[PDB]
Amino acid sequence: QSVQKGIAITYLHVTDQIMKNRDVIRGENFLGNGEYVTFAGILEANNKIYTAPIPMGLSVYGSAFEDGKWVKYPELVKTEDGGSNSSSYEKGELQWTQYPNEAWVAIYNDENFNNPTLIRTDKISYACGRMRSQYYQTIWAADNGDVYVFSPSYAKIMDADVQKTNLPAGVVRIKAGATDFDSYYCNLEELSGGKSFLRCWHITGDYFLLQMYTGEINSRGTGATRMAVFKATGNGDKGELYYVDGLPEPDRISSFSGTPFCENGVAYVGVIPITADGETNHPAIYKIDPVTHTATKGLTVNATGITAIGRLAKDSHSTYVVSATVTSASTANYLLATSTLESGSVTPGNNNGFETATGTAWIFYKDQYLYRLQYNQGNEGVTTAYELNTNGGIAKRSNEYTITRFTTYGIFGENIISSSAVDATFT
Template sequence: MKSKTLSKFIAAAAVLPAAMLCGCSDSNDPTPGGEESKNGKFVFATTVEGSNASSKVLLTGESLDEGNLSTVNNGLLNDGATQWVFHKNYLYALQYNQGNAGTTRSYILGNNGEMEARSIEYRISRFSSYGAYNDDIITMSTGDGPQSLADSHGYLPKTLLITYLNVVDETSRGNDTSTGAYSMENFLGNGEYVTLAGAEQSGSRIFCGAVPMGLSQYGSAADNGKWIRPGYEHLVHTESGGSNSGSYKAGELTGTQYPDECWVAIYDNENMLNPTLVKTDRISSPCGRFKSQYYQTIWAAENGDVYVFSSSYAKTMTDPLQKTTLPAGVCRIPAGSKQFDDYYCNIEAQSKDGDRSFMRCWPAGGNCFLMIMYDRPLTQKNPAAIELAIFDAASKKLTYVTGLPDNVTSFGKAVYSRDGKVYIPVNVENQYPAIYAINTTTAQAVKGVTIEATSIDGFGYLTPVK
């Protein structure tokens, strides 16, 4: 692990256009904000691309609203992360390594105002989403269960793989999958397995998007194909193929047979067992997606109401039977409840041309949410997520953000909200990235601190740990 300041030759190297930030990363961002103290600092995880080298640097600063921060002889070198997570005055670097386990390390702000790497580095299970509960950061994915649970064909059931990172104790533990208690097979009663998107704490409960993935080999073979819907037989793969996140095995039915449903799994505590499952048919699956990563789109407002957003990603499916007919929208589970109420808003209808969806969303304070919007319908080729909008859940109004630069290439993976504003990194072509402050009432963006780097990969606020 590198732990010295960035050298002059790296800082002096030519800075390339900002890299796309919406890559394989997770889907939930515990959002800090509003708890600043005179002893704390803002922390920026950055990438600096030179002509011959790339460096990851953690910088600290006093303000989001003004100034410039340089990487010249400044900041803490580190090994980088797929996702930077700020939680309870600790910063965690979550690393996603395709289908394999990744490593993580955590950081604190020292009493001298400089970033420090903590002592322990450990491996975590492959994750496709993550969240936070009390003192834990929780990473999750759905993968093969133990060999002891194989069926007569040798097929393994899909199971939930969890890593709990206790930020205070700096420990890591996984869940015991040997008993089958964490099975993701037939999770919704229709034979399909699911993956979980995000983990949002509201009160003592955890709310996760339950995203149906289709039939695994195990599910497809169960009871001689009981769970294959009539007319859907052609969707079962006869041979293995694909690559990376699009790979599949012979006997699998990839993608759900029920695209016009939205399911939420509500857990009573961090053990994530025996969830209450709630459903609505007004929106599709509750997640955003990029490759094998599932972005959290279930968020609690400040009053505890849980808003469930769907980007209608199933519109991108190839087979008409697997395409959703539902527009991108949002429903609600009231505070303290385990059921959807009658709240509904068609977000897509308020988008530009009335046909656009979103990649990600976050709470922005009060009943407002910040959304990264696509520049064209999901059904068109290569939609780019390069616009922002504020959604006011109380008035059910979507307002596009103005004041952003014209040469946006991507947005950051985290936001920070306070005092009626929400802040997000904005990466632009052939210029340094900057943090922009967006007024949630007017949807007007104003440029704040500029970071002399190639990209801002994450940011938040830390106070020294006593």
């Protein structure tokens, strides 16, 4: 028995609030070159699970294995601890992949994560966005079940030339029910004016929303203050990309709220300004119409930030929920109720004061529950969940758990699923 890298999987089962730690999956040599992986995203489509196994380089175990067999670039192996935050490294590791010019997708026939089908492409680098410790999902399904695998080519900012990818940001495709790539390929940098992206989502049909970088990619996801609409089958199945018109221009935007809320063929996203002085400059929710790639200003949020947008319902009661942060001399979080995202305002206070702890990731399960996932660096994550009660008020569900540290999440079936690469002992 020895300490190896593994893939931890946590299930948050929404019907009964049960939390399950899966047996840890062996991550050493997950892709056949010795490197270990971090899952990026958990996508359900065609009754399968799709994730992107993002290579991490070699663990200490990986660089020791069979007399260093897996070490292609020994000049990159570390001889002491170093690095910072979630990118700290230890003596003997080879940090980040030696194989940046490829992407993998792992496909599972159900949520037990047994017997993956693994498919490799040379057309794109690995399929995830990166923000501090977090691995953002960039694999998404069209309405017909075709899965589009996007890569922002994050690896371009690696220090070591051999660890940089030379592939532009781009997209490939897995047709519904298939477990091979087809021939589809779109070079996104040729459509975006040379720009890449932080993360992306599905809007409707074959329209996807990309949160675009304004300049160079960076490790903190800052300055990703444009949106663009991608029509995957546009221009004779070559892809079409349009920057969104009608949002505040980038030098007014501090950040976007994160995961959009999609209904009725459009996307809603929160915009947090750099300077929020005066009501017309407070954070606000914008509606993005993918057909016209046009945004319109909607609900104003009289708070410091916006962190989630969705819908909660119970019996005949139903409301939009906007998660909003308020920073003073620390930071409070409020779940604000509204019947519209497109006008008026919401303000934390006596008639809208459901306070929660802050969260790193906010996930709506359908219109039934809101899950908060709190990231705590090297320590355990924390999760709470929220619903409408039978009176129609927002309420916290009773079970509050520490969970394995997570760096990605998604949904399959009745489970919110979260994952990260962990140390584990195996036979």
